[model samples]
Target: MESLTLQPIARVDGTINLPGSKSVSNRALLLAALAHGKTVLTNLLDSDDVRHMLNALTALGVSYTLSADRTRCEIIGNGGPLHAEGALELFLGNAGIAMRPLAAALCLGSNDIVLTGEPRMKERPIGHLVDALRLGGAKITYLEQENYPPLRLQGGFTGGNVDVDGSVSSQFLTALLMTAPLAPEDTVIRIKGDLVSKPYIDITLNLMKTFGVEIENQHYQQFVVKGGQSYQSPGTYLVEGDASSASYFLAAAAIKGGTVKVTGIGRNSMQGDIRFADVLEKMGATICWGDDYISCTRGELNAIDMDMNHIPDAAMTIATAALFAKGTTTLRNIYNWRVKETDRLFAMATELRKVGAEVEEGHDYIRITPPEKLNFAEIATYNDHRMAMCFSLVALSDTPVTILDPKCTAKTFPDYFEQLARISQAA
Candidate 1:
């Protein structure tokens, strides 16, 4: 594996203009593609995940113009669901955000569509969403594994009441909800289990409204959307900077604070990970929040135990930030971590230990005890973007840290290390 060694950093200080959100970009693009008019999307995230969504849209016959930087996209909405000339195959690489939602969207369209991805994508389960789609009069079948991806789908989703297990991923519910507005009849969706990452669903609902579609959310247990409804173009949609991406920089300020301010996410931001700044405040970091920005500065860091089910993506930074804390940090109720990217729980535990932190891993939780003195080590990133970005914090200490395959960040933040280098005052 190719690894890059990061020199020890003394402090972090600067203004970071965050890249656009992956979640919002993909969701907005799909909605725009299905809307009744042309849509101009600004600040779209230029990354692997969003690329897959865009590429698939092109293959499905949606026309759009992308800027050279890939930050802006002007989509000429087909005024409805995807219409292809013939059968099509889309290779969506390990982007569950793209795959799950697309799977539902495609089922509401015409023609035979086969959705496949990287080897890891085949392992990720989409059965819950598929089962819900089937309940709504869509024809779908598993090509290989019973519950996994690589699906052959035939569209014709007529609205009906269906129950979906929400325990696995909120994306499934989001996918189902996005598809519901286009269903043939009134669609009512009931959650079968306690939903994890409930905030993400809120994002889905709010974005749907932006495109002129409304969903009646009943206590997060059930959702209702009238069928035969269509999305109306919002004209101009600005994707907020990724709050999950901001976690790394915010945690950096906590580790070496010359006071770092991350713009594009703030009090009014819809992303749940924005609350991660609050967690930093709880860890003794000085946090100043604005309507569209949040700044973090170094403080006396210490550990605190909390259930972080709501912010699993941002919570990964917390596990690494714990190394700079005074005591053990416990992150609980994150069993879903097992299903994302790689086995994050196990990967985090093993890597933290490699850096001399006393780490304990459970099925859904992790407790990290910082060592008296850190060890200089090469951290292996398991083709997971967050792992590579989170482990970069290790360099804040006196010891240098090496990150293996740092390029894994292309999944979301392509210029992550470059941005980090800009504000990084490594000694």
Candidate 2:
């Protein structure tokens, strides 16, 4: 339970049914709670992040019944903004997916709500969302630090035209877009700068459309949503498998495989992390894609230099995949990694160096050149789920790797090591 030592994996080959996406599950749950009628969501991610959203909804007076396995949820919608009497405090525990959107949702009704999270979540910035919400007349004050959570929300957002600085995190824009349809007045959201993670916005818009609310997306720069609208429950929703989680298995096969097939997410996945398969293909992995599955076979992997801003989370898997590649891999335009569960830029650079890879950690990018032979080292995960999952690839090399706090993966994928073990062939 303290640390997990993975012996050298000779090969990995099997089929893995990925868990529900963390991004899609949280968004769908909040929208379903705000919608009219009843919603039955299947394949919902049963993880700490989604648990935070469910707990927050329970505190806000939303009614829901979860299945025994916790993947199927039946929620009775509140028809509009959430309401609760008196003061309430929610501990979100490092789930940006829950905190950002919930902060904006709580602002639509008159409630004295305080949103706080884990120590790491307190460090992540929320100022962009707060500034945009305040522009629409929401009363939100930073409880601890400026531009970050533990936020105090006293509902008063009457949305109209608001400008949000988009250079930081796309979750701010997603929060505004999800909250706009319920605003008393029509909302027009303009971006002040280039938006990071543009595809995540697409996922938000796509899910919004599924819930029967539509927004006018002006090429990712401006969004127009009609106010005085309500989300109509689609009755039944199925969350797609997490593409970010698929990256590890796919990359494992790409590094050392007879073949590996990952089910649940594929070319049709709404999540942007699905693009990671293309990166693997570019690295010379043989890829076969079906509507809901992708299989990978090993090949000579050549390092790639590309802008990975769109697929931020999955790009971490690429960092580890680089160790198996032929040359230097440069992942660029991913400055937001610094504000994640940890300072991923610094953490990844330090850990890769521990494994004998030459790493150049840049302000907005990382350049990695694989060592001729990897060294056995204890990889520090910094409590970032992605960090732990990504570094698991070290086992594909001849060297054994020890992962500190492997339980950190419970934030998203609780049984990741078990699933990985089912398919791994020990040397």
In lDDT terms, which candidate is top?
Answer: 2
lDDT of 2 by residue, 1-427 (tens): 4899999999999999999999999999999999999999999999999999999999888999999989999999999999765659999999999999999989996878999999999999999999999999999989899999999899999998999999989999999999999999999999998999999999999999999999898988899889999999999998999999999999999999979999998878898998999999999999999999999999879999999999999999999899989999999999999999999999999999999999999999999999999999999999999889999999998889999999999999999999999889864
lDDT per residue, candidate 1, 1-427, as tens digits? 8888988889899989999999999999999999988999998999999999999999988999999999989999888778553447899999999999999988885659899999989988899999999999898979999999899888877879988999989999999999888877999999997999999998998899999999888998889889989999999889999999999999999989889999999989999999999899999999998988999998879899999999999999999999999899999999989998999999999999999999999889999999998998889898899999999999889998999998899999999999998889754
> Which residue ranges in model 1 land beyond 4 Å of their true spot?
85-87
Model 2 lDDT on a 0 to 1 scale: 0.93
Note each model's CA RMSD in angstroms.
1.0, 0.9
Cα displacement (Å) at residue 247, model 2 = 0.3
**Model 1 residue 107 CA deviation in Å:** 0.6
Backbone clash count for every predicted candidate, in the order shown? 0, 0
